[PDB]
Amino acid sequence: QLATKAARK
Amino acid sequence: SITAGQKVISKHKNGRFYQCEVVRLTTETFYEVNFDDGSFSDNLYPEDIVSQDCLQFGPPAEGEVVQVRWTDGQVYGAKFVASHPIQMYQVEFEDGSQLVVKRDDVYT
């Protein structure tokens, strides 16, 4: 699958 | 944990859980980066790093500024966080269909 992003903390 | 040939439970493409068999173990390397907007990705391919040649010369140092080609084609600025050697499991279901998944998606 392709890379995904998200918020941290 | 899991070895090859083992029968496990994992999620099918249809959404439901099924017994499936573990046919291959691969160790696969994913990069983690902190984008400048405060977001992060830990499942990047090494070749998604466009400011250096990582397949040939390895990962950027930890905390190094990098430029990343994202999944929309466009380049974003980031800092390198880590390369992750992750245990992958290629699993086969009764209908002959195979997935490649990681540990939290496979059940003993």
Could you write out the DSSP letters of every residue in B33-79?
EEETTSEEEEEE-GGGB-SS-HHHH-PPPTT-EEEEE-TTS-EEEEE
Across the strands, what pairs with B24? Answer: B90
User: What structural domains does chain B harbor?
Assistant: 1-29+85-108 (2.30.30.140), 30-84 (3.10.330.70)
The two tokens of residue B18 are 């099924």
Q: What separation in angstroms does the CA of B68 have from each of A4, B85, B87? A: 13, 19, 24
Distance from CA of B4 to the nearest CA of A (A): 22
B39 touches chain A (CB under 8 A): yes
Q: What is the DSSP letter of B12?
A: -
Residue B66 near residue B51 (C-beta atoms within 8 A):
yes
CB distance B93 to B20 below 8 Å: yes
B81, A5 contact by CB (below 8 A):
no
Residue written as token pair 């944990």? B1
Q: Is B105 helix (H, G, I), strand (E, B) or coil?
A: helix
Method underlying the structure: X-ray
Q: Using the structure block, give the residue that is written with the tokens 């046919």.
A: B23
Question: Is there a contact between A3 and B39 if contact means CB atoms under 8 Å apart?
Answer: no
| Resolution value, angstrom units | 2.3
Return the structure tokens found at B94.
């009764």
